[PDB]
Design a protein around this ligand. Structure first.
Ligand SMILES: O=C(O)C1=C[C@@H](O)[C@@H](O)[C@H](O)C1
Ligand SMILES: O=C(O)C1=C[C@@H](O)[C@@H](O)[C@H](O)C1
Lengths: 271, 272
């Protein structure tokens, strides 16, 4: 029986144990995944220990994603850019591979929701860790362009230039947005507190698809805002959570498990 | 999907999540068992929060067992006698039941290993919480006697007098043990630190069954020592760990899960 886990602090609200348990059963893998809470300043040791005992791989949640990036022996190109690591894996030679599946998890959720990323104009709102982690995977779907925005242009300007080589990535300030986008992606949390970014709603249209990384019962405030202005389809981030898990499972087992039944089940619990 | 957990600090990679998760699979129980960190201010705070948010039960590792004893609204007889709680359960009426499964876990592991406890002469090395927690369940098996021993006499004598009523219990100091015993139980941590108790190996004989509460790859130092003096059977505490887990699981789920396959997998992990 192979050992996997999720390390974070706190862990009582983690859905990964549930999710992975089902992935193992769906793909008939002989593995166990548990949630292990770790002291704020003991991740490295807890980790080195886990692998010492025979740990195959694990997920890293807050607040250890940055320490995980340093703990990894080698990093994947997407973890590289992300600046964080949410997935660890012990290789054959003993090395620990650091990766980041959050962004790819978002990409797969979009595709699962039937959203065409190929040749699309994308507006990414926010420039924090969340936004940073999803740029590369989006660019791999070969969109027409990606527009990054932040309340403070400077930080949005850094991020757009970080991936300028990978494609048409523009950086603009809230005040400069004056056109519609095919896909609007919200990576900011302000909305959970009722706050909306001061952006002209012209960004939304009848052909627009809105994706919010936040999630909850019914629709997120950002999505409701998106529909007040004619947004065609609005998706929350619950699928991103299952998607990132699916990609990690992929990395460890070599098979992408189905996410549809699991998502639908987590959806019930929330409601 | 019921929530259960184990509280430690650390919590240095508890095996309980692994164990209980497997029991769940074998018994097809809809539940998730996690390893929770206990905040510096107290276990009591963790427990409240845990049971407040829908938790149905949890294990408690040292050194929070005494605090769990106070948190419980009701204690089983074995918990009152052990003076510590390793298992909490939220009952249907809202009350939190406090039980202690360590002792029974030991007993079942010994019985699973074909060790006769009824009418046996037992030597319990150590007189701290670990030792105290196994006395009642061992006494229930009706052994001929149980000799509690400790580096410093007084402590062992005090533990013996605490349970004197429940059976033939005597106390002796390390330097006084000059006879063999049918079953020897090591409750100290000396085997983890690499030391043996200052006890003359005469306590071991060809018929002796030696049980060490600590566990690891190969034989524990205490067991190697027992084998040097020809004990008939040396056992480590991995079974006690799984056994106490099984008791708690039953208490919570009303079903008992098997322990041999689980115990065999853990052994495989230990052996590198
Ligand atoms: O709740 C969880 O278990 C997780 C949350 C996110 O940080 C994910 O990025 C992580 O992989 C696992
Ligand atoms: O390491 C563990 O998970 C445990 C250790 C012992 O204290 C047990 O009494 C406890 O219930 C579980």
């Amino acid at each position: 029986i192979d050992q996997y886990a999720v390390f974070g602090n706190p862990i009582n609200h983690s859905k990964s144990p549930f999710i992975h348990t089902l992935f193992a059963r769906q793909t008939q893998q002989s593995m166990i995944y548990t949630a292990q809470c770790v002291p704020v300043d003991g991740f490295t040791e807890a980790a080195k220990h886990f692998f010492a005992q025979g740990g195959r791989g694990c997920n890293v949640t807050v607040p250890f994603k940055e320490e995980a990036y340093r703990f990894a022996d080698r990093l994947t190109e997407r973890a590289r850019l992300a600046g964080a690591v949410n997935t660890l894996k012990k290789l054959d030679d003993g090395e620990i591979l650091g990766d980041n599946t959050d962004g790819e998890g978002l990409v797969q959720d979009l595709l699962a929701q039937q959203v065409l990323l190929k040749g699309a104009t994308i507006l990414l709102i926010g420039a924090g860790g969340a936004a940073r982690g999803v740029l590369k995977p989006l660019l791999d779907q070969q969109p027409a362009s990606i527009t990054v925005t932040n309340r403070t242009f400077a930080k949005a300007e850094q991020l757009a230039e970080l991936v300028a080589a990978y494609g048409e990535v523009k950086a603009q300030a809230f005040e400069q947005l004056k056109q519609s986008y095919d896909v609007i992606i919200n990576s900011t949390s302000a909305s959970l507190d009722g706050e909306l970014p001061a952006i002209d709603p012209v960004i939304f249209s009848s052909r627009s698809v809105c994706y919010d990384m936040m999630y909850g019962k019914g629709y997120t405030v950002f999505n409701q805002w998106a529909r007040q202005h004619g947004c065609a389809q609005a998706i929350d981030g619950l699928g991103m959570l299952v998607g990132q898990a699916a990609e990690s499972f992929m990395l460890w087992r070599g098979l992408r498990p189905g996410t549809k039944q699991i998502l639908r089940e987590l959806r019930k619990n929330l409601e």
